[PDB]
């Protein structure tokens, strides 16, 4: 995984590349508004890709509780901010997660923290959706998991096709959410 | 800026984007990243295409004599710009109003003037002033009012991480600045 | 109209051929005629006169307060590209004792909207027609429209809306009358 | 192609000038002077779709993401032209598909909409054409396309029904054969 | 009077039966058998305001509450009949008044609306009649009445404009003479 | 017919004049002077549908588009007249069918039956049967949602009450999944 | 109940309301409370007017032969009732659906049946069942579905004080009870 | 004051039992058995404001925060009883005040609403009482109170006007004398 | 169960701990705004945990009627205010309850009062949801019970993940609500 | 406040929270409460992190010369604070407007100034004033306007228990206070 030492070491290389981009765009990197931009853009890009340095074990912090619960738990409307790996422009939206506990429940915030491990990377929405579902499955081993991601890709609104209102909806269903249609429909209506 | 400048600077932009991918700990050779230095460079060139535009070419002599001396408004113009401090988008709406001096501007040219200045590395306050000044210079009307409302992704997906924050800026010239009733009317007609 | 119909159909058939289309296809067989009839309907306002439209609908109701007819659906044609511009018209007026038939305000909108237009002109024409037909203390007309030339083409700005207004008499000279009208139409 | 456009532009402008005269208008007045040309260029833009090929539009944007679950791109703004009256019909396209391991690049679904919407159309045909284009480009497990549109021919003339909306759909593969897949797509849009 | 209603009911039923025959319909079919009577009774109910007097409606509901501030009763559902085509016009009435120490019973404002709306009307007349009735019944510092209505003569026939709404108003006393009182009333009703 | 309309307009106007007098009103006052004729013309317009035939309305607008999937035209504004009280009932019509008819013809079929003295249940069935007879499709579904002014401005005086009626023919009646797909696609 | 019963019981109702005003520490002689024993008694008599009604008189023979065998719904019927436990209102909407057996009922008569039972001292569950049973007895249709959604003021301005709380009750008879597809179609259409 | 409730409870229950008999009901049926007592307790709760004093309610919650600017507590749910029919009238209270350096604890504005709303009322009186109680408890530069309510006497009986809402207001001090203060308060209370 | 004597005895222990918190945060417990805070915070925490002091029997008050009702009764949008047991920060939302009476019906307000027994405690949402459904099944013995809780956890919005719009939805289905899918879907659509 | 103060005071906060769990009648040894004294103490430190912040460090020299003399507004800034009277949150939105004196501030610094004062034990009126004064001192503009709209949980989940009540406070400095037209323009734009 990526480290804070890797971030400090790579920051001047990122700043050098951003300064080179400003010059290549016809801009003056010495004007007041651009003076600190190579560094602020480099730090922003490091923050946008901070998920690479995260591990599921550290994120969970042993937040698995024995609540004798065998019914669907949903955490919906998790704000998600990711980066398109094809154009390096953001894609933002919401993540809705549902799961069937096998007696043990995961701490509610850990579902949002798992979203943050994978969303803070250079992504493709389909991959991001699958990774979240698989992480929950491996961390807790529940009866089933369901993940739905709804996002606006800025590559499709401020450029290219320039379709203003287009939204991409992806889903990943594991266990009972995949095998039992009634579980799957209940999750989709509750979100 | 020119199209020759774009062709010449494209490989330098692609080189800097490839360097960024390596500095972030990513593999520039994986399927999803193979064409990214080029697609990211082309996207950044499109986002900064306003530098190569001139008001005269954009207007195309669209000034008509309609014996009109009353406020004309073009509201809800979708605007997509790039924060010059972090190189992350800031997007929103532009609302333009003007009092013609017998002659009217072609409706679309107001949105095209927005595109000259929004497709640049910007600060919202500057973008707002530039649009109002361009309209005043192109038409010489009794007055111009420009209101920009935008979401800065630098404030939502990083830093302060304030989800719902919106920045509202305005520039009032001529009668819109000197006459309070004119400014009061424009502001009500745009909501 | 009857004499012009075959000339319009001939021009529309010529357009179909110039676009690379087969004017003989089942779907395009009656298109030169349906397109010509549609364009005649879209421009029917040229053949209308204010006097015939009013039909003597002026009533003596001893009214000296603002009457508003808002949300009148308006469908016009951009004279620059020949593509529609559609929206709403909001009309207000201050009668001079005599009130006008409510539908006649919408019928005045139809005289000028069913023409090749520019929104600023259309707005002025409606206000002037009301002033000439009734001679009231004042008239106010607000038009809010979507120009398809700006949404399906050119700038391709999906949510842009154009707002125009024409204030005559008391609506122009008295700011309080003007602001009351603007709040009552929202 | 672009060569055909330049050659046919003066013939389109001549026909539009003829229309202005036949409507009782003055083609020499300020507002109408450039109209035969602007109207001809607009009609050529509205009919771009004819000169486009699926292969060029896709640009090899097919990625191996080991995905076998429904992908939806909804609320794609669509602007088309009624072939019966030559008046626009505008709305939204909602596309869903069940990939077979490989995923098409999201924008290419919106670009496929543009190939067939920028033509003289009938909504039912446009709906089928998008669904078929996706099936042919990707060969997925299934495709679902829903188009919801306002026909200006029904709002500004004829029946003059202001609020009427036409909803069409085309379901191929698993979207047609499996009722549960089809209902899931319809609720997610 | 109720004596006038009993006496005129068979004449109304005879005219409605005559209408059914003149429209090409069969007045003897099951659906139309009782229609001349049900239509006549409905028309008598729609015009019941003619048999009402302000004094009877008021029922001495004037209380001494030492109140000199604006009282508003808004969103009063109003159903009237167009006198030009005999088709309904329906909407809302918003009434405001500045008491002169004495306050009218809230329901009596709606009952005054019913005296004038249940008649063959013109919206401008109906608005004035309500304001004048309140001024005569109470003698307050001022009265304001705003009527917003959909005329079915404009939606299901003639111009056939579906969304058109007619807004009329009558301001008496302080509501007419003091602009600030008038604007306060207009903002408090636009809920 | 139009000759029937010219012959019956004076009688309608005399019956309306008689109504104005029987209500205690003055048919000689300015507001009422032209009302007998204008109310008569309005009632004729509201009952226009009886003079219309499906064949004339269709205008041969049947196209071969090789379509076997559901086509829906929803939110068609409908204005009808209650046959029990002669007061309007207004709302929306949502039509679905499995083929190809010209889209506007569905709204024109609504106008044939809505412009008559009606009962909502009858109006709904007539629209569905007219489409089935004109096209012979796999199935038709018609949903009418209306406000009856007889129930809001008089009688029970229930302000927000709405009546929903439906008619399902062919596959829309026999196949549960086709009817449930149509019912979800008409929700706006 | 009858109108003669209302004239006879009116002074006893007014006496009880006057007694309530005195027991609350109020002055029944002050301007605002002077006519209150009578206006409160008349209001309570109007709120309980459903006791003096009969299904047969309210239907007024409004049964038409329209050859209809498909679902008819009258939704959003405003309903105002009185809680029999605290004598405080419970108000909301009634949504009625039915599958005719060729014959249709007059639209307003469904709302009039709601008025027979809502204008009484009630419990929402009883009110819901009574409306469904009255329609079944008046029409004998294939099935009836009734859904009542109400705000009980006893739960918002007093007691538990949960002001967004809404009670939803339902009664399904015939095909609405036995056929799940009929039941779900009715619930989505309302 | 609490002793008055225990002493008067059997007299209230006797009057409610008498009402049940006079309505033609059986006071001995299961649903009506505890009703004379539950109705009496409910009426005592609805009129509990009579036993409250401003001094006890305030609990010395006056803080010195050097504040001289408008403080607003809007959307206070209010439940009162119509003194004419003994049927509820419910709505919202929006209070504004200009402090004279000292600020009242926010909750005490809602508690002042409860002193006067829990009584047999007239909306105009209730509005004035709240404003006068605040003016007396703090002696601020000015007070503004707006009450918006639905009278059940007007919806489930009498005029039977479903959507009618009564809006009353009381402005004291600067809120009454300064029009700009008054309009600022009225705009800030719109939600 | 907790008692009023327990509350009086522990109130000065709670104020002492709150006063200690004010000092440990670097604040001045003697400034005007903080002077009564140890007591007001202690009383508030006692109110937030009053459900421990309550028993189902006292709460019901014999409001179990004998109607002839065998159809679904729903009480939805019950405002619920609870306290996260992990951080001692509120979690607030709505509770929607549905049940199938076995002829006997419960008093409507008692469903909301059962919500109050368990929500006014240091909780976990999944536990709170189950306790409400189990209390209803034990008090009434109906054909089935369904409970849905939708809440905003302030630990998730004003700190930690800081996800502004995140909502947690939990459910507990007993009897016919668990075993019959049609009953379950009807309840879920009627609560929207 | 400092990071050393936080490390030193964390065990004292945990001790007080453990003492609160015992005083409420709870079992501090049960699974769900075992780490609570520490998680509650860390949460309270985070809620009060504003005490360790200085306007100078927060600004980071983000003052730009953009020749701007017109109103800049940053609205809908989500704000989370703590009631100093009950130690229960009060949350809402902050809307800030200012008239620059040629120099503009970095947009995010307005939200960061909100965070200095909201992350403390507060009173809404003080929070609003502190926010407007910090902007005036940092930039010296022509005027500043701050509006705070909040839900106090002390008033919704306890005490008066008024569900929908919202507190609106404002602070206007400079031209926002002295020019009524500037003040009204700001209030409509937010
Ligand atoms: N007036 C104005 N301000 C603008 C933009 C665009 C950006 N900015 C603002 O420039 C500042 C740069 O600050 P900095 O050097 O401290 O960076 P950094 O530590 O990464 O900051 P932060 O984001 O707080 O983490 C920020 O305050 C940012 O918001 C605009 O349009 N108008
Ligand atoms: N199925 C159906 N029913 C319809 C219409 C239109 C109307 N009706 C209903 O005929 C009944 C006639 O009753 P009646 O003779 O007793 O009239 P009247 O005393 O004035 O009654 P009311 O209105 O209660 O005061 C009413 O119930 C009315 O609603 C329709 O479309 N479909
Ligand atoms: N200003 C004011 N007025 C109020 C209340 C509360 C009630 N009222 C009004 O007292 C009047 C009592 O009249 P009355 O004697 O004629 O009764 P009744 O025949 O049953 O009447 P009605 O209702 O028409 O059937 C009504 O007008 C009612 O609205 C309030 O808060 N402020
Ligand atoms: N199923 C059903 N139940 C109904 C009504 C109407 C009321 N009720 C419920 O009877 C119960 C009475 O209990 P009780 O004797 O203890 O009274 P009281 O202490 O004042 O109660 P509370 O309000 O908690 O303070 C309450 O639960 C009430 O809501 C209905 O329509 N259906
Ligand atoms: Zn991209
Ligand atoms: Zn930035
Ligand atoms: Zn154009
Ligand atoms: Zn067409
Ligand atoms: Zn009319
Ligand atoms: Zn009727
Ligand atoms: Zn009750
Ligand atoms: Zn009353
Ligand atoms: Zn927590
Ligand atoms: Zn507090």
Author numbering:
A (entry chain C): 58 to 248
B (entry chain D): 59 to 249
C (entry chain T): 64 to 249
D (entry chain P): 60 to 248
E (entry chain R), H (entry chain O): 60 to 250
F (entry chain S): 60 to 158, 162 to 250
G (entry chain Q), J (entry chain B): 59 to 248
I (entry chain A): 58 to 249
Please quote the authors directly:
This reaction is the first and rate-limiting step involved in the de novo synthesis of tetrahydrobiopterin (BH4).
We determined structures of the human GCH1 in the absence (xtal_GCH1) and presence (xtal_GCH1+active) of the substrate analog 7-deaza-GTP and in the presence of the allosteric inhibitor cpd-1 (xtal_GCH1+allosteric and xtal_GCH1+allosteric). The same degree of disorder seen for the inhibitory cryo-EM structure was observed for the xtal_GCH1_allosteric structure, while region A is ordered and F122 is in a defined closed state in xtal_GCH1+active. The most obvious conformational change upon substrate binding occurs in region A. The partial disorder of the residue range 115 to 130 is resolved into a well-defined loop structure closing the upper ceiling of the active site pocket. This disorder−order transition is clearly seen in both the cryo-EM maps and the X-ray structures. Further, region B involving the triphosphate binding pharmacophore becomes ordered. R216 is part of this region and, in substrate analog complexed states, coordinates the β- and γ-phosphate of GTP variants and contributes to the charge compensation of the triphosphate moiety. Locking the R216 side chain in the presence of triphosphate ligands thus leads to a stabilization of a preferred conformation of this loop. Here, region C bends outward, toward the active site, and the protein inside expands in comparison to the apo structure.
